[PDB]
Amino acid sequence: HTGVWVGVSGSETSEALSRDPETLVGYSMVGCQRAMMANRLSFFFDFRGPSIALDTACSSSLMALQN
């Protein structure tokens, strides 16, 4: 039931890949969405617990540790 709390505040790569409507690929949503930063880890490691992506700025990592 182990769960993944990840402190992230920047999703810049999401913008770069989603800048051209003609040739974008739907994979970018799976690979760049902020929430996937933890869901990918849970998917690979087979964790059935929580998977959150906190966003408080400059304190997100320690907030994840507290959670």
- The letter for the amino acid at 29 is M
* 43 lies in the site for its own copies, by CB under 8 A: yes
Which residue of 13, 51, 61, 65 would you call a contact of its own copies, by CB under 8 A? 51
Cβ atoms of residues 36 and 8 within 8 Å: no
**Can you list the pairs that 57-63 forms with residues at least 24 positions away whose Cβ atoms lie under 8 Å?**
57/9, 60/7, 60/8, 60/9, 61/7, 62/7, 63/7
* 55 lies in the site for its own copies, by CB under 8 A: yes
Question: Least CB distance from residue 36 to its own copies, whole Å?
Answer: 6
Residues making contact with its own copies (CB under 8 A): 1, 3-4, 8-9, 11, 15, 18-30, 33-36, 38-40, 42-58, 60, 63
Q: Which amino acids are annotated catalytic?
A: 58
